[PDB]
Amino acid sequence: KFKIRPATASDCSDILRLIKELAKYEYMEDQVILTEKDLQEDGFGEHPFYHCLVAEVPKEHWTPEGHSIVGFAMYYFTYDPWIGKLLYLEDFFVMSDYRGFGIGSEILKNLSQVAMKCRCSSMHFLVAEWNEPSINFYKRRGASDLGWRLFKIDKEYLLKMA
């Protein structure tokens, strides 16, 4: 019905499409500046900066536009000074017409295996307070709630400090 597997270079175009689809639930699609080239260069070179799992369905189940990828998860490893290695889930999305069949659960299942393989102590991720569905989805699977502010110094200034 569907296969959850590691992403490949040729999946990048599908990954970009879903990232954007995910940005429509935030009403900021125009905010995505990454291209298929950036994704290939950043995820499939010598040193990947991210890792991806995708959901591929059979031909008689592709989208009308002809896409074979209907879901994905983007993640990377982070480190915590107190407990160590963590698996950080950055994005997680399943297209509308492909929800309810267990794709999301299968993806989380593969993410858990990647985590145990990493010897990671936990998997962390963000969830919008207003997206109850995703909340109840994660809660039923062991997730639990976990005063600082995120600052940013752009290249502009970084280059100056250098």
Ligand X SMILES: CC(C)(COP(=O)(O)OP(=O)(O)OC[C@H]1O[C@@H](n2cnc3c(N)ncnc32)[C@H](O)[C@@H]1OP(=O)(O)O)[C@@H](O)C(=O)NCCC(=O)NCCS
Q: Which sign does the torsion angle of CA 27, 32, 36, 39 carry?
A: negative
Site string for a second copy, 25-44 (x = CB under 8 A): ------xxxx---x---x--
Q: Is 101 among the annotated ligand-binding positions?
A: yes
Q: Which does 85 bind (CB under 5 to 8 A by kind): ligand X, a second copy, none?
A: a second copy
Residue written as token pair 């997680």: 92
Q: Is 144 among the annotated ligand-binding positions?
A: no
Residue written as token pair 């639990």: 144
Burial of residue 117 (CB within 10 Å: 0-12, 13-18, 19+) is: exposed
Residue written as token pair 């536009």: 65
Residue 100 sits in the site that holds ligand X (CB under 6 A):
yes
Q: Is 131 among the annotated ligand-binding positions?
A: yes
Chain-centroid distance of CA 116 in Å reads: 18
Q: Are 143 and 92 in contact (CB under 8 A)?
A: no
CB of 41 to ligand X, least distance (A): 25
Terminal alpha carbon distance of the chain? 52
Given the complex with ligand X, which of 25 and 157 has the nearer CB atom? 25
Q: Is 138 a catalytic residue?
A: yes
CB of 99 to a second copy, least distance (A): 18
Residue 20 sits in the site that holds ligand X (CB under 6 A):
no
Binding site for a second copy (CB under 8 A): 19, 22-23, 31-34, 38, 42, 49-50, 74, 76-85, 88, 90-91, 108-109, 112-113, 115-116, 120-130, 135, 138, 141-162
Residues annotated as catalytic are 138
